[PDB]
Design a protein around this ligand. Structure first.
Ligand code: CL
Ligand code: CL
Ligand code: CL
Ligand code: CL
Ligand code: CL
Ligand code: CL
Ligand code: CL
Ligand code: CL
Ligand code: CL
Ligand code: CL
Lengths: 156, 156, 156, 156, 156, 156, 156, 156, 156, 156
């Protein structure tokens, strides 16, 4: 039977536990997700309390990280999502994504309405991935793809 | 000589005037940007107060929207950026981009550090893009790609 | 060509003009929405800045309210939605719906997950109606129906 | 004799324990409420810290969840209600109910005054329910019914 | 037909106008309410944007204050209530009532539940009067009576 | 020697323990205060961290509630007052007192200046009392009286 | 008859106009207060929207500053007090007094209780003066004296 | 070698421990500071986490309060200063000093600039003291003296 | 006679007017400061409402920018300082300085106490400067130098 | 394999422990950083949770401070940065750097755009150092150098 959380601190504390075990075992997120049949961003997000793992994947990551049974169960619960401590990130890495909203939020709105119509790009119907590639002017770049579904707002 | 703003309200007011004229003339953002040599997201963002147009682009868009001379001048000013009214968007379309941060912000941090290292993905050396794609299962999918430069944080 | 707003105050200013004209004419929202083909709540929400009217409806309600051409155009724009002045309503009538969230939000989460699964009840895919019924104990009750769609969240 | 709480964290901590036990036993909220004579939304809200269970119900759910006597006593306390961590939900599932307020709050006010008069729809003399209904265009529709008493505001 | 407001600033601007007129005419609130059939606290709250005057009262006070026709109509509108500028009053005289809540809010909760039960004392089914009397120990006291109905919350 | 607190949490944690004991013993606040010579509102407020008990009273209530010695001493401390978790109550019962300020705060100020002059009604030389009175129309009325000293502000 | 304000911006806008006229006339607050028979700090506070002038003082200062009759009437109103734009000062000069509270607030409380007892030092029965005193080790010191009455909080 | 804190909770937790000890020994702040060579307000502020004691004074108060060696060491650390839980005090006694800022903050600025010039009165080079004085109208008066150095702001 | 402001909006409005004239005349901040005797950052801060200009400097910049007499007088007023619209900058260029605080603020504290002792680095007895330097690895380095006087906190 | 944190409290708790150990050994930040090959501000920031140490540095500082293996592992994790408890520093020493932003933030923006162009000085590409200098007029000054790369924002 599906089970859900209502207080984020339970799964966020579990996340800190997972991170220590991961560091102690010198593991990557890529290798923890290996063998789950699930994308690295989905599995990572679960570990960090923002998604629920199916039972088989919870058991597999739990074995990797030497987690107890209550931890393995908790990873299968539907989370109380929200990873930002207090609404606006303080961490520079996370902040940049917030800054994108500050600079391009209204442009994204305007061009979503022009290209798709009145409604939204779903934050629920998703796939997410992060790639590193060379920058042609030197150095490296991130190409992060958010693959969402347009959901129209229509009169009733 | 470069000129810059310190109060966002001057350019956001101009954005509202620009959008009324745009509506009255039944124009798209695509056609406003057409002929400027500048990307539609860049020109859009400038009309909306979040980038500076070079003089020739400001004159071209100003002729298209029947803007006055002070307005064309204002569009060339480096803006006081920040499009969100009060920190967290109230608008559902814009809100989804905030919710993405709430769900995936720590995952984005985690994967950036794993794949690139310590530092940030910069959204000044950056361009965002929205593609319409047919969902193979009915409806339309927005693929939003975020491309920024990795700037490392290194010991000194 | 679709047109969109980015600062809520343009349409909220128009809303207050609408309400003054409506008061002088002694109009009801039911009568304004008469002949429109659209639900009372939908049209009312448009007048108040939170939905867009199709051109014919904008023309009709604009005739009823003696609106000028710019105002009729404004009602057809996709709004920057967000009706609450500063996040938490001050108005008692409005505040009761917020209090509903303070008391039942986590219950709504838990029951949505049990009945449907991981995901959301979609705020954009919608219909809303307010019905006055008799309270058998004396007085009246409001029955407010929120008719939404379940959108699942699934591993990838 | 009636007993009340003044800090929500006592009952919210109890909720987290209830949820871990419920998950360990793979129970649904529907079955926990079964045998209690009380609506599933009512009982669920109690477990989650937002309502008080009568003594018979507290004992009955306490038996099903293997709760100690202090916990069964706590469930009978009149709570310090307020389920949202910090005013605006971060969790997408709960956030959609907040967003309905941001889109429709003023419409709800305007139609309540039109149909009933000055005053409020109460959230104490109130019930809530959630029904699943197949969308005739594929998938599941969620109908949420909010039912409150009208309480007039009159001159004095 | 009943008319309502959605933005407090319209009625609060009018309240400032009413206060300048009242000051110019050197009137009291007691004098303004006299011959109205209505309690000074009700009429005063209406002038200050927090209640709706019935038509007869509105024209009466309108004549006294030399108000224009739009102003007399505005006074009959159901307000967007909320008199505090930003949530916590800055004014010492207003602050003291806020401080009563900070010191005695939980005691008020506890004693309401003991004396009446689970529920609220409605702040709507109300009447309010302020009296000045001698303090037996010297000086003057305010006796402020808040007469409201208990509305129970019962299991459902 | 008088002793005072600077962190409310010490007294608020004690309040919770007090409340658990009270419930385990099925005591009322009336009965806890009976025998102490001290008003029920004062004794209750002290238990909940908002007033200081004299030593004898602290011992009397400590006996009744089976409290340890550090707890009996803590009840005698002058508290760091402030019972609201975060400024605006989430609890419906307490929120109603906040709502009364949002509706009537400016009217209270206006009538206080009219009746008394410039200054305040003191929340310190003060007593609050709650009295049950059946409504003529069925059900109960809460008549709540706020009685406070007027303290003038005069030119210097 | 006494008159009062409910929106600080009326008196604050007047304050700014007073300040321009004062600067145009190259006047000091000392000189403006000369002849009123009222303290510098009181009269200054009045001009800045935080006290009420008696009529004669208001006519005197109004003559010095060439205020119209509406302005002189406004200066006699009991203000809606609160001079800080948004709770915490941004101005360094004003900020230092806030910093004094951050450093010494709990010490002030502790010593007040030790020296006087439970209660407060009033901020209404209160006079203030700023005095320049030569500093022995070079420079100037300000000695700000806060002179207010102890108001006990007693059991009842 | 000087030692400094960066998280206030270490020293604030220590202050609570000190206060329980002080209460258990029925000591005053005046007694605690005797023999220290330091002003009562300074020593008290140190115990409460807002100043650092010299080693000899830390040892002396440590002995009086029966503090362990880590605690005596902690008292010598330069604190992370800021005694207000959340920016605006809830406690009435502390709140009065905040209200003084809200009433007189702009007057303080105005008179400081007039008497001294552009710059600030220091809250670092700062001595303060609380004196009890009888009121010739009856009762007791607090005279708080804030004695700070003037620090000018000049062009560069 | 020294003159001072109490509401930042007067000088911030003037700043926007100044910036428009500066843009129309195609002037640099270096050119505006030319001839004044005053550092670029000091004069720029004055134009932007954060510093007062000596009269001769005000007259000079006023001539260049074609400002009226009232405006030239306003620039001589001691401002109500604080340039950030709402506490945390939204603009990326300004934000980086805030983020420096979030990353290195506790380090700055720690190293300041180590090198100098207890107290502060003043922002009054203070100047800053921005210098351009070539990056040998390509492009340009900005070296920002913060130079402030150490002001000790000593026991009293 | 690189490891990263998502909850600052883990590293901030470590920082408090480091600071107690450091005080017990009477250590300086200079001596702790000696021998690491890394700058004082960099190593200090790492101990304080705002930078990550390489393995050899982490082992070296951990030997000087008698840290356990888990703590040495923690120091090597990329942190969740953000040292300010709640956005605006309460501590005077840290606050002065915030005040620098409030006075000069817009000047910094304006002069960055004039000297460099549109874009940012990157708060990541960094070295900072704090230098103690003789003040010619008497006392000491802090010279703080922020050495960052200009990152332009260009049209596209
Ligand atoms: Cl990925
Ligand atoms: Cl695009
Ligand atoms: Cl509770
Ligand atoms: Cl249901
Ligand atoms: Cl009355
Ligand atoms: Cl009572
Ligand atoms: Cl006022
Ligand atoms: Cl003075
Ligand atoms: Cl003292
Ligand atoms: Cl410079």
């Amino acid at each position: 039977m599906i089970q859900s959380q209502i207080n984020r601190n339970i799964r966020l504390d579990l996340a800190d536990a997972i991170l220590l075990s991961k560091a102690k075992k010198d593991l990557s997120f890529a290798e923890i997700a290996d063998g789950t049949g699930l994308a690295e961003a989905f599995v990572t997000a679960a570990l960090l309390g923002q998604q629920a793992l199916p039972a088989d994947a919870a058991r597999l990551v739990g074995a990797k990280l030497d987690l107890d049974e209550d931890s393995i169960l908790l990873l299968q619960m539907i989370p109380l999502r929200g990873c930002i401590d207090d609404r606006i990130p303080t961490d520079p890495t996370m902040y940049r994504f917030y800054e994108m909203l500050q600079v391009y939020g209204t442009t994204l709105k305007a061009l979503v309405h022009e290209k798709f119509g009145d409604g939204i790009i779903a934050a629920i119907n998703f796939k997410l991935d992060v790639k590193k590639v060379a920058d042609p002017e030197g150095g490296e770049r991130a190409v992060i793809t958010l693959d969402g579904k347009y959901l129209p707002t229509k009169p009733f």
